[PDB]
Design an enzyme around this catalytic site. Structure first.
Site, PDB file in Angstrom:
ATOM      1  N   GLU A  36       0.821  -1.135  -0.404  1.00  0.00           N
ATOM      2  CA  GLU A  36       0.225   0.087   0.273  1.00  0.00           C
ATOM      3  C   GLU A  36       0.931   1.574   0.352  1.00  0.00           C
ATOM      4  O   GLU A  36       0.334   2.232   0.892  1.00  0.00           O
ATOM      5  CB  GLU A  36      -0.764  -0.018   1.558  1.00  0.00           C
ATOM      6  CG  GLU A  36      -1.982  -0.685   0.791  1.00  0.00           C
ATOM      7  CD  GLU A  36      -3.794  -0.357   1.638  1.00  0.00           C
ATOM      8  OE1 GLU A  36      -3.691   1.033   2.054  1.00  0.00           O
ATOM      9  OE2 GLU A  36      -4.587  -0.803   2.080  1.00  0.00           O
ATOM     10  N   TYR A  88      -5.601   4.637  -9.910  1.00  0.00           N
ATOM     11  CA  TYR A  88      -5.687   4.161  -8.499  1.00  0.00           C
ATOM     12  C   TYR A  88      -3.885   2.680  -9.119  1.00  0.00           C
ATOM     13  O   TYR A  88      -4.590   1.994  -9.098  1.00  0.00           O
ATOM     14  CB  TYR A  88      -7.102   3.687  -7.408  1.00  0.00           C
ATOM     15  CG  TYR A  88      -6.067   2.891  -6.792  1.00  0.00           C
ATOM     16  CD1 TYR A  88      -5.276   2.548  -5.177  1.00  0.00           C
ATOM     17  CD2 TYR A  88      -7.257   1.613  -6.296  1.00  0.00           C
ATOM     18  CE1 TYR A  88      -5.617   2.797  -4.350  1.00  0.00           C
ATOM     19  CE2 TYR A  88      -7.030   1.235  -5.306  1.00  0.00           C
ATOM     20  CZ  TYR A  88      -5.862   1.260  -4.266  1.00  0.00           C
ATOM     21  OH  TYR A  88      -5.599   0.408  -3.539  1.00  0.00           O
ATOM     22  N   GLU A 147      -0.460   1.229  -6.783  1.00  0.00           N
ATOM     23  CA  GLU A 147       0.304   1.278  -5.713  1.00  0.00           C
ATOM     24  C   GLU A 147       0.890   0.332  -6.197  1.00  0.00           C
ATOM     25  O   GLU A 147       1.752  -0.306  -7.563  1.00  0.00           O
ATOM     26  CB  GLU A 147      -0.418  -0.163  -4.871  1.00  0.00           C
ATOM     27  CG  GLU A 147      -1.849   0.362  -4.132  1.00  0.00           C
ATOM     28  CD  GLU A 147      -2.500  -0.363  -3.155  1.00  0.00           C
ATOM     29  OE1 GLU A 147      -1.817  -1.586  -2.567  1.00  0.00           O
ATOM     30  OE2 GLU A 147      -3.476  -0.665  -2.130  1.00  0.00           O
ATOM     31  N   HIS A 203      -1.306  -8.064  -2.964  1.00  0.00           N
ATOM     32  CA  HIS A 203      -2.370  -7.759  -2.561  1.00  0.00           C
ATOM     33  C   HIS A 203      -3.482  -7.690  -3.210  1.00  0.00           C
ATOM     34  O   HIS A 203      -3.235  -6.814  -3.977  1.00  0.00           O
ATOM     35  CB  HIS A 203      -1.620  -6.482  -2.109  1.00  0.00           C
ATOM     36  CG  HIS A 203      -2.683  -5.552  -1.176  1.00  0.00           C
ATOM     37  ND1 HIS A 203      -2.834  -4.282  -1.699  1.00  0.00           N
ATOM     38  CD2 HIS A 203      -4.169  -5.896  -0.236  1.00  0.00           C
ATOM     39  CE1 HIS A 203      -3.635  -3.168  -0.757  1.00  0.00           C
ATOM     40  NE2 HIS A 203      -4.288  -4.653  -0.188  1.00  0.00           N
ATOM     41  N   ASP A 260      -1.110  -9.244   1.531  1.00  0.00           N
ATOM     42  CA  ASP A 260      -2.641  -9.651   2.462  1.00  0.00           C
ATOM     43  C   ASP A 260      -3.213 -10.082   0.947  1.00  0.00           C
ATOM     44  O   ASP A 260      -4.295  -9.317  -0.290  1.00  0.00           O
ATOM     45  CB  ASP A 260      -2.666  -8.024   3.050  1.00  0.00           C
ATOM     46  CG  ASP A 260      -4.216  -7.884   2.534  1.00  0.00           C
ATOM     47  OD1 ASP A 260      -5.485  -8.420   3.476  1.00  0.00           O
ATOM     48  OD2 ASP A 260      -5.039  -6.713   2.583  1.00  0.00           O
ATOM     49  N   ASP A 262      -3.849 -11.639   6.595  1.00  0.00           N
ATOM     50  CA  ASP A 262      -2.514 -11.535   5.829  1.00  0.00           C
ATOM     51  C   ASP A 262      -2.033 -13.206   5.822  1.00  0.00           C
ATOM     52  O   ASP A 262      -2.227 -13.715   6.920  1.00  0.00           O
ATOM     53  CB  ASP A 262      -1.730 -10.202   6.282  1.00  0.00           C
ATOM     54  CG  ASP A 262      -1.850  -9.211   5.811  1.00  0.00           C
ATOM     55  OD1 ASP A 262      -3.328  -9.014   6.958  1.00  0.00           O
ATOM     56  OD2 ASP A 262      -2.133  -8.632   5.465  1.00  0.00           O
ATOM     57  N   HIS A 311      -3.881  -2.796   9.330  1.00  0.00           N
ATOM     58  CA  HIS A 311      -3.563  -4.430   9.477  1.00  0.00           C
ATOM     59  C   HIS A 311      -2.532  -4.747   9.916  1.00  0.00           C
ATOM     60  O   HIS A 311      -1.132  -3.781  10.335  1.00  0.00           O
ATOM     61  CB  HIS A 311      -2.948  -5.338   8.208  1.00  0.00           C
ATOM     62  CG  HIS A 311      -4.097  -5.286   7.655  1.00  0.00           C
ATOM     63  ND1 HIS A 311      -4.730  -6.204   7.568  1.00  0.00           N
ATOM     64  CD2 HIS A 311      -5.069  -4.450   7.032  1.00  0.00           C
ATOM     65  CE1 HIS A 311      -5.343  -6.170   5.953  1.00  0.00           C
ATOM     66  NE2 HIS A 311      -5.986  -5.464   5.679  1.00  0.00           N
TER      67      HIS A 311
HETATM   68 MG   LIG Z   1      -7.793  -4.708   2.740  1.00  0.00          MG
HETATM   69 MG   LIG Z   2      -6.850  -0.941   2.243  1.00  0.00          MG
END
Ligand SMILES: [Mg+2]
Ligand SMILES: [Mg+2]
Ligand SMILES: [Mg+2]
Length: 263
Positions: free
Chosen positions: A40, A79, A81, A136, A170, A215, A255
């Site tokens: 992230e 968007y 990451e 992720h 994740d 996770d 997390h």
């Molecule tokens: Mg999430």
């Molecule tokens: Mg999130």
């Protein structure tokens, strides 16, 4: 014994650098780890260099230096990451890295964030090298995305000599996203040569009101599996460890990190 961690840091952008309290907790978490996957990361300049400066200030052990490899910006459009691996330079090195790409039919179909696969050389462990495949997932498509991780494993075996694998990140592998009945359709679970180090009963959520193992860490390869230090595989509760309140812990992340140790 070397510690490998995966840590989803909620919205790790420029803004987060300003909460010194949250940033100090993040640095401490990283400092426990020899390799850590951070997810992230959200920035179109550089957040990964401030972090290295912060972690290398105590130039301690005349060399507990950290370096990093970071993926490209990955997503459908605005968007994006990044996946980053931070690692102790003197203990491991990066042999190769690549972004998974499905050469068949739909080319950007399954993962919105394609795994950034990294091959590590580890001269001091029993296992001299291993591959980490990070993921992720998008919560509502976790069943399909987790399942497709067996196709990344195949591709990496075709491309590299590699025998030992760690899948981590994740997966959103609990609660309403991956219910109990859905495990049947995930080849990463029904093929028992894949060994799950974080089980379905773990809590990886900082919030007290939820108990889900979002996770995860999964191994493949008889060498690396039998090199896992017994009881090392766990969730690191940074909230209890640094005596933080729920609000302070939520500023760090939603997390908890997961980790294990290799002999
Ligand atoms: Mg999430
Ligand atoms: Mg999130
Ligand atoms: Mg919780």
């Amino acid at each position: 014994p070397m510690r490998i961690c995966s840590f989803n840091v909620r919205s790790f952008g420029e803004s987060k650098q300003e909460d010194k309290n949250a940033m100090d907790v993040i640095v401490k978490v990283i400092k426990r780890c020899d390799i850590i996957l951070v997810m992230e990361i959200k920035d179109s300049n550089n957040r990964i260099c401030p972090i290295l400066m912060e972690k290398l200030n105590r130039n301690s052990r005349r060399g507990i230096t950290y370096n990093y490899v970071i993926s490209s910006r990955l997503g459908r459009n605005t968007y994006k990451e990044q996946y980053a691996f931070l690692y102790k330079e003197k203990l491991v090195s990066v042999k190769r890295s690549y972004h998974y790409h499905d050469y068949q039919d739909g080319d950007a179909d399954v993962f919105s964030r394609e795994p950034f696969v990294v091959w590590f050389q580890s001269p001091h462990t029993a296992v001299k090298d291993f591959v980490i495949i990070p993921l992720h997932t998008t919560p509502e498509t976790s069943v399909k995305e987790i399942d497709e991780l067996v196709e990344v494993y195949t591709d990496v075996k075709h491309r590299w000599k590699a025998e030992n694998f760690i899948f981590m990140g994740d997966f959103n592998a609990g609660c309403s996203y991956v219910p109990k009945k859905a495990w049947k359709n995930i080849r990463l679970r029904t093929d028992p040569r894949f060994v799950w180090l974080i089980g379905d009963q773990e809590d990886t959520t900082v919030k007290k009101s939820t108990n889900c193992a979002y996770d995860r860490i999964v191994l493949r390869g008889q060498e690396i599996v039998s090199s896992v230090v017994p009881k090392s595989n766990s969730v690191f509760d940074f909230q209890k460890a640094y005596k933080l309140t729920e609000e302070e812990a939520l500023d760090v992340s939603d997390h908890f990190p997961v980790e294990f140790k290799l002999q």
